[PDB]
């Protein structure tokens, strides 16, 4: 099994740098070249550069030559990629990959799991959790909608479960929106039987790991 | 530099039907010496790395189902899914390795197509807790609808608002293949309490009439 595991997520401010690791295993590391491809949120895949495992030869994309630096450590069988002079537009999931390894015999293609690099000036901030109360204006027949505003947090992500995950049906946690303040805001809903509002308690469970935030908010009618 | 253009940006085809993704290269990527197009087709599901489906345009990577088909040559290429499964709902990228820099297409969002479903529209007033913090967010919820386009119009004192509210759409649901949409109208506490009617009008082709959910104060 040929595995490329790569480093955890990083959050950097503009002007800083990031070094992203790519540990290779399951094959003879000096044989193949590791490519680096980034993908901005909702964007296409963008190739940045490659390096040969044993030679150390590099080729950079023209868009990044002046900030990117891919290196080799044959001792650790690990590939590194250092993007300098970071910009919010560098916010992307960075992949290392053995792209289209087409040898005379068998062909294969293997990618790292992804490193989410977030470039923003916002400081880490826990979310404010506001209840979206169910009422006559959030009922459709026998069903009632209720939810929670998870507003003004950095960075991504937040986890929202309902009744500690015991309520799964009709739960819709929306993708967070990047507000003009640099902070994120999302908002998770659930539709339930409208008379169950008097017999159940409904809790959204907001987990924000980067800020150590565990907020349990009760949604009253 | 070699621009890879995919068509369409998004297609919705029903279960067991046929899916064709088109891809056009800015430059011919065919090497006459070895008779091979330097094209690659990738599949990527949300939150996962891309998966190589086809190399040399038509050569299939080991373990790819036979319903997938890579075709085309020169500048025009095609990825064909003969009978779509729910496992094939992903973004598909064409990729050239003919010259540097390596480029990918814009991607093609392949989605499950089902029957037109109407949205269940709900509206939420700002919680007291939020108004204490100086801000008021009004949320209009569109639950389980299809197709993906809906039109959400915010009306304040019946005056249509414009570009002044933020909207978020879900992934296609795994069970009923519908979408959900949440439109958030954010105002200051003053602005909120200087107005009276707050309404979101929703247009959808599952609706024979745009629906409005209102509330006062």
């Amino acid at each position: 099994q040929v595995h490329l595991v790569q480093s955890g997520a990083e959050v950097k401010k503009p002007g800083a740098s990031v070094k992203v690791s790519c540990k290779a295993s399951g094959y003879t590391f000096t044989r193949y070249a590791i490519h680096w491809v980034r993908q901005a949120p909702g964007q296409r895949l963008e190739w940045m550069g490659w390096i040969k495992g044993g030679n150390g030869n590099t080729r950079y994309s023209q868009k990044f030559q002046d900030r990117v630096t891919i290196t080799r450590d044959t001792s650790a069988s690990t590939a590194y990629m250092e993007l300098s002079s970071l910009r919010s537009e560098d916010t992307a999931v960075y992949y290392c990959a053995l792209l289209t390894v087409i040898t005379p015999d068998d062909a294969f293609d293997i990618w790292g799991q992804g490193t989410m690099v977030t470039v923003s000036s916002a400081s880490t901030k826990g979310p404010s959790v506001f209840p979206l109360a169910p009422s006559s204006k959030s009922t459709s027949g026998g069903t009632a909608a209720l939810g929670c505003l998870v507003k003004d947090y950095f960075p991504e992500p937040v986890t929202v479960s309902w009744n500690s995950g015991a309520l799964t049906s009709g739960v819709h946690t929306f993708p967070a929106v990047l507000q003009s303040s640099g902070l994120y805001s999302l908002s998770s809903v659930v539709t339930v039987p409208s008379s169950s509002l008097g017999t159940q308690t409904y809790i959204c469970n907001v987990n924000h790991k980067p800020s150590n935030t565990k907020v349990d908010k009760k949604v009253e009618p | 530099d070699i621009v890879m253009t995919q068509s369409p940006d998004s297609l919705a085809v029903s279960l067991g039907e046929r899916a064709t993704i088109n891809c056009k290269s800015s430059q011919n990527i065919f090497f006459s010496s070895n008779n091979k197009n330097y094209l690659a087709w990738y599949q990527q599901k949300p939150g996962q790395p891309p998966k190589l489906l086809f190399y040399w345009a038509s050569t299939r990577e080991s373990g790819v189902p036979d319903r997938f088909s890579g075709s085309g040559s020169g500048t025009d290429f095609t990825l064909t899914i003969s009978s779509l499964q729910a496992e094939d709902v992903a973004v598909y990228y064409c990729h050239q390795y003919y010259s540097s820099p390596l480029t990918f297409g814009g991607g093609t969002k392949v989605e499950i197509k089902r029957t037109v479903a109407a949205p269940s529209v709900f509206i939420f007033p700002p919680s007291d807790e939020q108004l204490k913090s100086g801000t008021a967010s009004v949320v209009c919820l569109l639950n389980n609808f299809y197709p993906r386009e809906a039109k959400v119009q915010w009306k304040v004192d019946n005056a249509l608002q414009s570009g002044n509210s933020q909207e978020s759409v879900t992934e296609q649901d795994s069970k009923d293949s519908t979408y959900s949409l949440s439109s958030t109208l954010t105002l200051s506490k003053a602005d909120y309490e200087k107005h009276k009617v707050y309404a979101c009008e929703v247009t959808h082709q599952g609706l024979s009439s745009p629906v409005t959910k209102s509330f006062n104060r």
Binding site: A33, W50, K52, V101, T103 | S33, S99, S100, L102
Partner: peptide
Amino acid sequence: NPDPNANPNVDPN
């Protein structure tokens, strides 16, 4: 004609 160093992992053999 194609660049063999565009992707070293592609050996034109």
